[PDB]
């Protein structure tokens, strides 16, 4: 699984893009995360978003990484 670290660093990168639309996969190969704002929370200011309740996350599986 994508680690908590990975997920949070991705959230830090795309904070200003974060919306109710699912983000791209955070990785181009291997397993990563997609994130979005829970639609019922579209109204909240972005610095009021609760990590567990307003940020939805799911694993996205891409092609294997080269070695």
């Amino acid at each position, epitope marked *: 699984e994508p680690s908590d670290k990975h997920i949070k*660093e991705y959230l830090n990168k795309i904070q200003n893009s974060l919306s109710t639309e699912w983000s791209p996969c955070s990785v181009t190969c291997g397993n990563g995360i997609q994130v979005r704002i829970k639609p019922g929370s579209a109204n909240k200011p972005k610095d009021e978003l609760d990590y567990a309740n307003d940020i939805e996350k799911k694993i996205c599986k891409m092609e294997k990484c080269s070695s």
Partner: nanobody, 125 residues
Framework: QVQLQESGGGLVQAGGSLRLSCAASGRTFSSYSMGWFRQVPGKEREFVARITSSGGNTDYADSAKGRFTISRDNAKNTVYLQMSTLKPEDTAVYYC??????????????????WGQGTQVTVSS
């Protein structure tokens, strides 16, 4: 990774005030959102306050709103918890925690990444 060490806990009379400190190793302190939790026997840590890495915005549990103030000094690599109007029910071990998510709100112990050793606050009536 960073290492956290809390201090400032002790014995305080009810109605009193107390300031706890939590210092971090390394030079990446400022990239972490910092939280304070507290723990009583038989129960898991409960959220007290949070201060984000990006913009120093703050958030408070219901038990702490109006009474407590969380602040940080990144030059000193320290986050602070200023508590006032202390009651016996506030007796607990107080923990600081670091969270790599730099924005927003976060009140679950499971969703923080690094933990201090805790400092005991005893409030007598």
């Amino acid at each position: 990774q960073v290492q956290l060490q809390e201090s400032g806990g002790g014995l305080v009379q009810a109605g009193g005030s107390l300031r706890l400190s939590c210092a971090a190793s390394g030079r990446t302190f400022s990239s972490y959102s910092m939280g304070w939790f507290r723990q009583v026997p038989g129960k898991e840590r409960e959220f007290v306050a949070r201060i984000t890495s990006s913009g120093g915005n703050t958030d408070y549990a219901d038990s702490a709103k109006g009474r407590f103030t969380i602040s940080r000094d990144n030059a000193k690599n320290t986050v602070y918890l200023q508590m006032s109007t202390l009651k016996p029910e506030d007796t607990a071990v107080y923990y600081c925690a670091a969270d790599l998510w730099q924005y927003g709100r976060n009140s679950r112990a499971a969703d923080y990444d690094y933990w201090g050793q805790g400092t005991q606050v005893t409030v007598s009536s």
